[PDB]
Symmetry: D2
Subunit: 434 residues, 4 copies
């Protein structure tokens, strides 16, 4: 892989060992190029920087002999720029097409293509045979891309939306100027869900009126609400021959959701969208979009206007190469034990106060009831180093994802992938104190 | 600004001299916090990194004594992740609200607020008292933002678009799902433009249809195409009480463009969008949005679904601080000379060959007609490491930004900000060898 | 500790929390300055770099308002210079005085004073109440500094040297231009050693000749040879009032050696020299000199002609801060387990090989006698990726540190401070294949 | 140089282009390996780091498949360690032989060797065809290395030393434990010099009493003292067949001294020693030893006890690659222009008061006599942000390099290579305000 004139400096024996050593050290980098799969063992940072560097040197703006008189030559002022862009100053993709190789880049294009290959590989490790693409934008902004693709490929003009009250997906629908048709949730004990029956009727109504609907199902949401029946909805859509897009914000981190996706993929799921920071532990900013429909993923990368920053994509490529499949499946295992601990501990506090360890579906988050004002108990936690706890009032429509009155005033906590025991033990402790 | 126990280690005169030094060194950093203006002298990389680290250590996730049990606690896996994000793992803003401080960040919120004030300061220096926001997305996507803001603020549902053949802004309209009323260009010998009389006309038409027209004008585009009459368009939109958005990709780097803007703001201009890389020499992937109406900027910052990456915004702050006002003016002066050098050389090349040094409006690019296939000539140039020169056919509609048959086969070159003298000479020279 | 203007950008509650985070993040650095001892827990790389930056910013050459008209003003050319010196371009100390602060480098002088104070606390927690100095040169060169000192202070002109076959110390003696009185080792079963009796007779013979003897003993050496009776030699050097220098190459890591040191300091011991790399896992290049005589340590720092590089001294500080007292004890504890494993694996290997798990004093290394050429076996090992084991014929005089004929042909392996359970199991299995 | 599998990812023509850019970007690095000379143009820091990386990867500790159970595996605890050592954690040289390749580190050995060859092509370009070696220690310690080499190779046992009152070289002769015969200086106007006739009789006299004399002459020294008649001493040393070592601390930077060395090599010069910080804008800590005798360079190399840190040697390398020969010449020319600016300015201040502009030999330093206590003036300058000025009393024997009463109380200022105009103008106007 690497070879340079080193003769006449050291004796043959040392010369050969140095070469043997140099090749072995570079082996992990060489395999990525040759196998393009998520490595079993995580690769060290310095070795990944050397990898990104090998690709960054292939971009046009790195040529010392070229005469540059273009309109966007990608000149940068500070070195700090090269650090943040990882050397990919020309950003990613060609105008109006993300996954399309940029003639001025070349290095950035290979890293993008390699990153999607490895993402797809990662999915196969998890049991999902899909076509995947890392997106340089939020998951909500990524949903827009999907909504926009369906809108141009099938003609969608209205979105059937099983109620999921999160600012992102809601704003994504309005961002693309598409009409929404909500589908209220219903109460059932301590839960809230959306009857697949009402969705099918919403779909029928829209089709009766002359529209071409498409469903935006939601697979991962806060405790109160049940993951939608992705499988069922997926059948309906196939029967009606309508596009189905799934908001899988944090579906990739655990089996509970992966299985639903596996079974839903049997029928119609045009695309799934997932957060890269919630699932691959990447800093905020990027998304993962996957599906069994190669045709649809391409359209998705054709919805993005202009060129984008390569940084978020590189961050993903960095989670994949840095963690590796072993360490990932291990974080997933640690998740399970963290959750259980979170339950068989939060349930104990139910004995102390009034009680009632709510019985919700979430394989990540738990909920406990309380008398005091949730919002206040929450803020009282914010001011105790605790980050992430939610305090919802039974009268909090948006927070409960239920238009009527909810049955409890609670405090939900999460056991996301990568959560440390301390986050659990001590979050519960700071809780008892109130 | 910085203080720590140093006593009982070194003599007093050294202890004192030492403190004196640490203060002078930080002087540039604290001046940024105190004044919040673009400094006259560019600050060196090491100091900017320290400035960014200071802000970085204020973000929740860096609290060694914190407790995260949230659904999204910004846990990163690799240090590389911190480098790329520059320590802003949480990213920028709240969900669907870019410029609204993120409770879990703080340091990231400060940094962004500073970027925007340092951005405005920078604009003031250039002669424009405007409200500005650095966006974490491409200029095309930034236009989608502005469009979407026009939709929820003034209910606009149609975009009047004086023909400007560029994939990104065109897609930008399609993405937000708004119809487009195209206003073709007219040929005028060597120049191509869009009659203002026709734009107002298109305005009256769409209004008669019951729609609420919105104007997306183009101030900066390739040679054949003139800049749209931004000032006249702004008067019209003032009269009809109709929104006006201006695609001003590379308006900031040149005085010719800044002047029309200064005049245009005299009337109605809700927003102007510029590439952060074409003007602040940042890697591709950043945007600059500015306007005299603070109310519209707030709306623009509420159009982005979800939370965004912090990186492109940090690239913009690195440019302004690293660059400084002095150097920027120097860069601008050099383009004026580099341009005039380009003009005369090309004019010289003319005469010796078939001739004809096209007379176009652009202050950065120049053209010269040729009696051979333009695409083959540009090809040969590429074969000489000359990057950027375009070879357009008189029949290439998208190239000439004209839907008819242009009057010439030519080659265009640019004297973009940052161009070297050798580049102009080492370009017109090679073209002559052809 | 860190105060900069942040008002008028973020709401009060986020302002407050922002600070709580910032102070907490720096608490560890703040504690070093306040306590100046080895931290209980290790400090991460970023905090240490930050800590070192704070100190280097106090160096005269970093002063933007400085005025430098000297022949030696640390003008450096490349940023890499800064990185490698860690910001200490002036180095440490003054010409001929390492410990004496540099008026041109208050920062470099502070980190060095701190490094020495922190190093002394590291020792006290290992049970040694001493004055320690981190030296900018290897242990062999460090020994020269000691010998040079013993000459300035006591007029020493001859070194009685209990035979220890390591090229470094022997070359240290000749470098300082001092004659050497080599006290041959004697055989005793599987062990070789220098009888305290013949060391005394050597000493008294040099005094009879009218010379001022100096004793350079060796506490740490390869298995074949026992450690020198430091306690007796100290008892003797004292009665004869003669300087005693100890080569404690790798005595810091093993408590077996520390104990002998503790009991030997009750007598005559001017200084002990240890390698920073072998005990603190530092890159090769530095040393550690120490004793109960603050007077002798002062003279030692006045024996290095000219000014020294800062780097090796910083590498030693990084080790102390990076590890922490806690992590260190685990290393020492893990080494006890690795040695137990090694011995029981080698012992079992000898039962089925041809026998003989040699009886040697080494706490870190153990030997197995072989029935065939050792050099060959050690070469088969070397060829199998195993590095470090030595193969030694019963004839190799330098290798057995015995001028007579050693009773065995053997292989010796080490279980030094950072050895992994896998390497030992592995290296032994491969020894078995052979 | 670089070759990895990139097919089936990008269109072929782009694939070729990226491969061309990559190769062109690696040219400067490719040349260092093939040519092994200082490049006409300086190489940017990023490529220098990469170059160092290709080398560090060859060291035996970076080998992943290796089983480490040796006594000195070069294990490192912090990533900072690998940064301060530039990857060469095993240091440089074998035990007791610097320039000899270390079987444990082919990388460090390769780099060291390249550095010595590149250092040699730098001298050749300055007019000196010499054998050179970069050392990991101070020029003073480097002088001890030569003295030691002289002692072993030729049997020297007494240093003839023309008085050069600098703690460093004086300490070097003392360190090596050699008897020093001082040859006093004589007063002649504002100059102090060592008559060669005095030197020769000293040699003669030492030979007389059976001893074997070695001459340590000083070529570069503080203003008052003239440079020893290096050429004559060299001629004389050849006639007597006696070793000759020259202290050329800062001779490389000024042609005035290089011309003297050229004429001097025409006779007898065993070795010259120079500071790499004062001549190569390197951080403090490294030396440069050179001579036309390759046999003597090996001997010096065999004078260092043990293994050494690689950092000082990497610093020298970095300086040669970073500056380039073109820039080095611009530094040499700026200093001549800065020297004259220092003079005329000091002559002006001469008239402002009593003061006399002393007529000294120094091509880099110049002095102005003053009536008040020079030591109090040098102190005031310090307070006023000035480092480097010397304030010597007519009675200060060590400061004047003369055992009698010098004829002036004066202040010394330098215009060493790399000095800024601001340092010069501001240092004088600061002296003026006093
Ligand atoms: C460069 C440019 C843009 C911006 O495109 P993005 O990829 O979104 O940065 C838009 N319009 C014109 C005319 C341009 O030249
Ligand atoms: C986190 C999350 C998202 C993604 O939000 P972005 O800010 O766009 O990354 C979307 N939907 C749900 C239910 C989420 O929890
Ligand atoms: C490691 C060691 C030395 C010192 O070697 P240097 O290369 O000078 O650091 C000296 N003696 C012994 C017994 C050693 O183990
Ligand atoms: C500066 C100087 C020295 C000191 O060199 P070190 O690197 O500190 O050993 C020695 N001799 C002369 C003449 C000097 O000018």
């Amino acid at each position: 892989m690497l070879d340079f004139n080193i003769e006449g400096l050291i004796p043959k024996n040392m010369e050969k060992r140095g070469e043997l050593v140099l090749n072995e050290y570079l082996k992990e980098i060489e395999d990525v190029f040759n196998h393009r799969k998520i490595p079993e063992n995580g690769i060290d940072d310095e070795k990944i920087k050397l990898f990104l560097k090998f690709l960054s040197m292939m971009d046009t703006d790195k040529d010392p002999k070229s005469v540059r008189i273009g309109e966007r030559e990608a000149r940068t002022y500070s070195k700090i720029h090269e650090e943040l862009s990882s050397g990919f100053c020309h950003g990613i993709g060609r105008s109006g097409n993300l996954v399309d190789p940029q003639p001025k880049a070349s290095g950035a294009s290979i890293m993008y293509a390699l990153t999607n290959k490895i993402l797809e590989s990662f999915f196969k490790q998890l049991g999902l045979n899909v076509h995947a693409i890392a997106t340089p934008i939020s998951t909500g902004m990524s949903i827009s891309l999907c909504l926009s693709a369906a809108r141009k490929k099938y003609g969608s003009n209205v979105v059937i939306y099983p109620y999921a009250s999160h600012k992102s997906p809601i704003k994504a629908v309005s961002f693309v100027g598409m009409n929404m048709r909500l589908v209220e949730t219903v109460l059932d004990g301590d839960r809230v869900y959306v009857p697949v029956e009402d969705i099918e009727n919403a779909i029928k109504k829209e089709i009766e009126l002359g529209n071409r609907p498409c469903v935006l199902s939601t697979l991962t949401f806060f405790p109160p609400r049940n993951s939608d029946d992705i499988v069922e909805i997926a059948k309906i859509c196939e029967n009606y021959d309508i596009p189905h897009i799934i908001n899988g914000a944090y579906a990739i981190q655990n089996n509970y959701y992966l299985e639903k996706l596996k079974k839903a993929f049997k029928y119609r799921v045009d695309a799934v969208v997932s957060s890269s920071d919630k699932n691959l532990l990447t800093p905020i900013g990027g998304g993962l979009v996957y599906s069994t429909d190669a045709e649809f993923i391409k359209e998705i990368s054709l919805s993005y206007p202009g060129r984008a920053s390569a940084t978020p994509v590189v961050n993903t490529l960095v989670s994949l190469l840095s963690m590796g499949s072993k360490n990932y499946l291990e974080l997933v295992k640690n998740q399970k034990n963290s959750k259980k601990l979170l339950d068989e501990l939060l349930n104990d506090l139910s004995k102390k106060t009034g009680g009632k360890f709510l019985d919700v579906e979430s394989p990540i988050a738990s909920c406990i009831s309380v008398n005091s004002d949730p919002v206040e108990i929450a803020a009282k936690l914010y001011n105790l180093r605790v980050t992430g706890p939610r305090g919802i009032k039974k009268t909090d429509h948006f927070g409960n994802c239920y238009l009527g009155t909810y049955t409890h005033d609670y405090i939900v906590m999460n056991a996301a992938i990568g959560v440390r025991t301390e986050d659990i033990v001590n979050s519960v402790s700071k809780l008892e104190k109130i």
